[PDB]
Amino acid sequence: SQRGSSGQPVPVSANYLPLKGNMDGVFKYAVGFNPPVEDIRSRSQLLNEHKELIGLTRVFDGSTLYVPKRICEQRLDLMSTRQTDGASIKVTISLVDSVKNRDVVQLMNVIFKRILRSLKLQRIGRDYYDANSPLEVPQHKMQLWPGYVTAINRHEGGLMLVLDVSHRVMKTDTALDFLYELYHFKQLVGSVVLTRYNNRTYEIDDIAWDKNPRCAFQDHAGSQITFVDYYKRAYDLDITDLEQPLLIHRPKMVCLVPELCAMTGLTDAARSDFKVMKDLAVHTRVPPEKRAESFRKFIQRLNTTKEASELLHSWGLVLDSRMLDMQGRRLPPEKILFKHSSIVANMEADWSRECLKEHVISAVSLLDWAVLFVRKDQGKATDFVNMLSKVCPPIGMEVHEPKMVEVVNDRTESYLRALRELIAPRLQMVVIVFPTSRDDRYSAVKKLCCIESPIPSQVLIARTITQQQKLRSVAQKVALQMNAKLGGELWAVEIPLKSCMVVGIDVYHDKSYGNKSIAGFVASTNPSFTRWYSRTAMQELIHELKLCMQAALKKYNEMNQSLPERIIVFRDGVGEGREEYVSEFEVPQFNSCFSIFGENYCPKLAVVVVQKRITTRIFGRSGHSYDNPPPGVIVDHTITKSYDFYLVSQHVRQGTVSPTYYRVIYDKSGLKPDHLQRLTYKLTHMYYNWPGTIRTPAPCNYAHKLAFLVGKSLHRDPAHELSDRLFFL
RNA sequence: UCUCAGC
Ligand SMILES: [Mg+2]
Ligand SMILES: [Mg+2]
């Protein structure tokens, strides 16, 4: 069965609304014009003189026609005149089909977008945000707009409506002031700017400052008008500065003026900042109890507005008034095997403290390592090392005095030279300490520590050695990371799938550097899933993932003198629409690449697609308060189709947990669905940078970290000597 | 890098 057993049935409730699945009499039609005018809007206008024969309730998408009632004649031929052409254009009617299951959705999304437009909602980006009731945050010139993201699809329980509250931050002030910050260019490159006088939301494409707002443009049959005059005529406002660089948008020569503009979306500066996130996230990160009512009061609003009320009764569909109520299951909390003893996770599924009191399973001993630092931070670094020697013996590690090396100063060449005169085979780890964060020196250093000289490093920033409180915990968080960078596993969980490799793939979208789309590739190399062989992929990915799979298979063979019987490939980084693309292109490549070795080697494969950015929300509930559900809750019925499941593994403190969507796009493994769901739950714990369950499984997040490291700082492939270790953490 | 129509 699709529904696995072995959990605990907890009453959950997702944010899906079951549309009334009785939408018949929706006969699709077709129109044929022996004058083939190549404009859908012109065709619609041409047939508009015959709208009385149908009614307002029609959908003419250029070629077809959707009507909630029998068309007047499925072979009727009328003559239509054109105010421009003047020809007696043919009018055609077709009894193509009453759509069964394919174009029903494409109709419902169109009419539902029309409905949401009737509620005075605007289309910004892809979803819909309100404008009457912003949530004022007048502390940063920010201003939030409530909004909703909706979709309708053929989920197993019929036709369901997705609905999840969104939020779109918009700048209270103007844009020219934002253009003051040029010298203290390539940033307004897709920034969704909107105006205020009408709240019409443009999307910007190209900026050429070679123009002035006083220029005139040929509009409305040779009537040149200047922007200063056009805007004062059409909106009765003035312009203070007459030299601002205009903004250009073109529908898929609209020259905007950046005094009436106002950006949406915090733009890399509020993004790279600790200040504004704590200010915004109090509102953006909505707790589940508020979100449930922000959902229900949307339905109370939707069943009161006149256009919204009438449109449903026109097409006949009855939108229900309360979210779904399913019966999810809660997988048992999983034991965490340490070296000597083991602790079960709490309901919170976090062992951040119990990992600081037990022994790691395999500790690599730091007999000889080094530290780099500056005069300004010599004392703090020395104390950090002195008490790092004090915290390792508790946790089962064993460290000794490092070759305490002082760089000359903070210039990057000094660090480069100091590393180059220091690297030797008789070495374990070089632990570097920087005064201030800067990607130039960081990248120039990590290239040397990850390409030229394969020495696993560890960068620390000076502010983190507070030497007041965040030193014991920082040392206990860096010792455990340094242990893993040396190929020593910390904790493990009983995974009863004997002799099965597990692979994890994720990609990193870059738009500037060639769009190479670095993709990581991480696979286990031991039957306990604690040591990961991590390679990388490069292409301008088709051919390199087969090479990485073959190399990882060889590596697993070397360690275990065997070959895996199963290969679970938790593919991630799929686009929102290519969820079937992998099921046809790369799965055949993975089956083909097995041919290099093996006596006709037959791995029982399973390619699982992992999706994070979804819009489902599983609210667990006991009573009448839809709270967050405890991590480890599986839902796979009446919400998913084609054998895929939703899993709540993350845990948050503020907000609603987003369950993660795993699609099983290839299943030859003979694994019962129960076992694969449980396994996908176990791999959640195995991330050695956060003791406790995380969003995606261990290999997927490992691969994401590796891909981000390669893309943002390395821009090459790491040395193949480092691969058997988790040099990336 | 202690870490999760409009112009
Ligand atoms: Mg993804
Ligand atoms: Mg790290």
What is the CATH number for A226? 2.170.260.10
Residue A521 sits in the same domain as residue A437: no
CB A455 within 8 A of CB A423: yes
Q: Is A647 annotated as a binding residue?
A: no
* Partners of residue A618 on adjacent β-strands: A14
Q: Are strands A518-524 and A500-508 parallel, antiparallel or unpaired?
A: antiparallel
| Distance of alpha carbon A628 from alpha carbon A620, whole angstroms | 6
Angle of the A544-560 helix axis to the A582-593 helix axis, nearest 10: 50
Residue A482 sits in the same domain as residue A504: no
* Partners of residue A661 on adjacent β-strands: A611, A646
Which ligand is closest to the CA of A706, given by its number? Answer: 2
Q: What three-state secondary structure class fits A164? A: strand
Residues 456-485 of chain A: which lie with beta carbon within 7 Å of strand B?
457-461, 463-464, 470, 473-474, 477-478, 481
Residue A540 sits in the same domain as residue A640: yes
Is A241 exposed, middle or buried, given 0-12, 13-18 or 19+ CB atoms closer than 10 A? Answer: exposed
A217 Cβ within 7 A of any nucleic strand B atom: yes
Q: Is A704 annotated as a binding residue?
A: yes
CA A340 to centroid of ligand 2, rounded, Å: 27
Residue A472 sits in the same domain as residue A532: no
CA atoms within 13 Å, Cβ hemisphere of A57: 17
Cα–Cα nearest to A445, from A464, A475, A423: A423
| Distance of alpha carbon A597 from alpha carbon A603, whole angstroms | 12
CA atoms within 13 Å, Cβ hemisphere of A187: 14
Q: Are strands A532-537 and A518-524 parallel, antiparallel or unpaired?
A: antiparallel
A214 Cβ within 7 A of any nucleic strand B atom: no
In this structure, what token pair is assigned to residue A55? 């009614």
Residues 623-682 of chain A: which lie with beta carbon within 7 Å of strand B?
650
Kindly give, in sequence order, each residue whose CB lies less than 8 Å from that of residue A41, ignoring residues fewer than 6 positions away.
Answer: none
Strands, E assignment, A97-142: 122-124, 127-129, 135-136
* Partners of residue A450 on adjacent β-strands: none
Nearest residue, CA→C1' of B4: A690
CA angle A449, A455, A457 (to 5 degrees): 65
Q: Is A210 annotated as a binding residue?
A: no
- Provide DSSP, A632-694: -EEE-SSS--SSEEEEE----SSS----EEEEEEEE-S---HHHHHHHHHHTTTT-TTSSB--
Strand B: which positions are within 7 A of a protein CB? 1-7
Residue A415 sits in the same domain as residue A555: no
Q: Experimentally, how was this structure solved? A: cryo-EM
The domain in which residue A516 lies consists of 500-714
Residue A475 sits in the same domain as residue A506: no
CA angle A404, A407, A409 (to 5 degrees): 145
Which ligand is closest to the CA of A728, given by its number? Answer: 2
CATH code of the domain in which A642 resides:
3.30.420.10
The residue count of chain A comes to 729
CA A641 to centroid of ligand 1, rounded, Å: 19
Which residue reads 């041409």 in tokens? A46
CB A682 within 8 A of CB A493: yes
CB A302 within 8 A of CB A319: yes
Q: What are phi and psi of A695, to 5 degrees?
A: -70, -65
| Distance of alpha carbon A373 from alpha carbon A361, whole angstroms | 31
Q: Are strands A16-19 and A78-80 parallel, antiparallel or unpaired?
A: unpaired
Nearest residue, CA→C1' of B5: A41
Q: What three-state secondary structure class fits A529? A: coil
CB A429 within 8 A of CB A458: yes
* Partners of residue A633 on adjacent β-strands: A330, A648
| Distance of alpha carbon A107 from alpha carbon A110, whole angstroms | 5
CATH code of the domain in which A353 resides:
3.40.50.2300
CB A331 within 8 A of CB A634: yes
Residue A406 sits in the same domain as residue A506: no
In this structure, what token pair is assigned to residue A437? 């964060």
A2 Cβ within 7 A of any nucleic strand B atom: no
Residue A693 sits in the same domain as residue A582: yes
Kindly give, in sequence order, each residue whose CB lies less than 8 Å from that of residue A391, ignoring residues fewer than 6 positions away.
Answer: A472, A475, A476, A479
- Final resolution, Å: 3.8
| Distance of alpha carbon A238 from alpha carbon A60, whole angstroms | 42
